[PDB]
């Protein structure tokens with residue numbers, strides 16, 4: 001489930017966002033969408049904590065001990081919510097100015113970034129062969145995501161600037177979260193709540209500083225459609241399910257498992273629906289398989 005959700009959210013997210021940024025007459029403030037995403041994720045996470053603790057009194061006691069009585073954990077997790085506030089805003093900026101396939105292949109540089117961050121920040125080591133597999137994975141997903149190519153003004157350079165910022169943000173903020181997540185036995189859903197609390201503040205502050213003037217003229221939810229809420233819904237689910245993947249595996253295995261899932265789900269749709277694929281995909285898929293194999297060997 002957690003990988004099938006992740007992919008059908010991976011596929012639909014960048015396409016739906018790209019669409020909402022290029023077809024609109026009345027155009028929404030994307031800083032707001034990023035803020036609303038943190039709110040929704042906070043709310044699902046609060047829901048999930050009540051299920052896990054399994055009681056109103058245990059739920060309340062957990063928020064007391066782990067939010068109200070853990071200010072240093074909030075302080076720490078404000079850093080990656082600051083970085084994710086930039087990352088997530090950069091994604092919206094990139095897809096406003098670039099083709100979705102051109103966004104997809106470029107954003108895959110997060111994979112080497114994330115590996116280097118893991119090695120540096122989590123006190124971990126990757127063999128010569130494990131490093132080889134990471135670059136092969138990156139080259140494989142590059143080929144998997146490659147495809148042919150608005151009535152709005154566009155700035156490809158600005159689009160590529162934003163992907164460079166988001167790639168750096170992805171490696172750093174993801175690995176910072178994992179470090180904090182795996183440093184104690186504290187619940188995943190506490191960590192998410194601790195984080196999304198600051199996320200709501202930082203994201204809302206960014207909205208005010210970027211688009212505050214024009215929002216006072218036009219309104220917070222100006223330009224919002226059924227498709228803008230779909231993008232927010234997908235970002236929220238993808239965000240939460242990214243955190244679960246980090247809990248049960250890690251930020252490096254997130255790349256291999258996401259790559260594997262896109263390959264297998266596309267292969268499933270070839271056989272079930274007669275979906276047509278490229279030669280690039282077929283080769284990309286084979287390198288994703290080999291990379292997973294190589295990565296998983298004894299050192």
Ligand SMILES: Nc1ccn([C@@H]2O[C@H](COP(=O)(O)O)[C@@H](O)[C@H]2O)c(=O)n1
Pocket residue numbers: 041084088110169170171174177192195235238239240242243
């Ligand atoms: N604990 C976490 C970790 C990541 N996330 C979200 O997951 C996404 C991470 O995407 P990448 O894997 O591309 O860095 C971001 O949208 C980030 O806000 C989250 O919502 N909660």
